[PDB]
Amino acid sequence: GEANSFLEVLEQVSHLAPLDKPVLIIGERGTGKELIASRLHYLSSRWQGPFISLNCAALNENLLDSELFGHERHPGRFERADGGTLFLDELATAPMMVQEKLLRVIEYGELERVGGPLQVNVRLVCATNADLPAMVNEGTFRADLLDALAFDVVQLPPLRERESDIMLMAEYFAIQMCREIKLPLFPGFTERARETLLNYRWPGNIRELKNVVERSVYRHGTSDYPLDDIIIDPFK
CATH class of the missing domain: 3.40.50.300 (P-loop containing nucleotide triphosphate hydrolases)
Structure with missing residues (x-):
């Protein structure tokens, strides 16, 4: 919650x-x-x-x-x-x-x-x-x-001031995106991914978290291995 x-x-x-x-x-x-x-x-x-x-x-x-x-x-x-x-x-x-x-x-x-x-x-x-x-x-x-x-x-x-909510909401958005692209299971976030998520300032807050996580799940594109690459900036 x-x-x-x-x-x-x-x-x-x-x-x-x-x-x-x-x-x-x-x-x-x-x-x-x-x-x-x-x-x-x-x-x-x-x-x-x-x-x-x-x-x-x-x-x-x-x-x-x-x-x-x-x-x-x-x-x-x-x-x-x-x-x-x-x-x-x-x-x-x-x-x-x-x-x-x-x-x-x-x-x-x-x-x-x-x-x-x-x-x-x-x-x-x-x-x-x-x-x-x-x-x-x-x-x-x-x-x-x-x-x-x-x-x-x-x-x-x-x-950024609700660090507890960041992984909760990230997991929520990731699961929804897995349903959207028909992945059988969200395979989790690596510790590297978690560091990326918890260290970033989220100037776009919840909108930006959702966008970032959905893109990241799509780019990853598999349930076989945990999601490691959090794509904050789609321009790179």
Whole structure:
């Protein structure tokens, strides 16, 4: 089963999920932030409402503003998440204009409408791997938004800090790949392979571990001998 640090996350999420308070998830790529956001939704009373997601980094300023708040129609992500949960990833990339508008939605529960407003009821979950307090000091993140956004913070441990989970998950992914390519048995990892796995920093965390292990099993391609060559870098 999962490491103590990850179990402590799951326990935190079970307590946070029922609240209608905004949650901030801090974690590297491939640590499962969106999955945690989804768990907060499905363990909440809003579980039958919508779960909407948006990656702030993916859009330029003008498109981000329209995608989040709408452009009268083109309903934005807040309107689409009404009665449910909205997950905003890579929050630190949101331009200052969007951050100010986000604060207003959090505190007033309304979207502005020029002329011709919308009240919305959305539980907000955001994610980042930036140091938001540091960006506040730099002027690149709003202090007021951070004061209202981070009711509580869920910090996902990177794989490198869950060394116990690395061989567990590696074996899991290896077995699944053996099924996919019809090997009769996963023949295990050599000690050399284990050193490679446990010494590497996994900057891509769980996604990268899966990719690495699946490639390695395929390249090895046999059940007759233990897997010795962990192919971290497919470019070599």
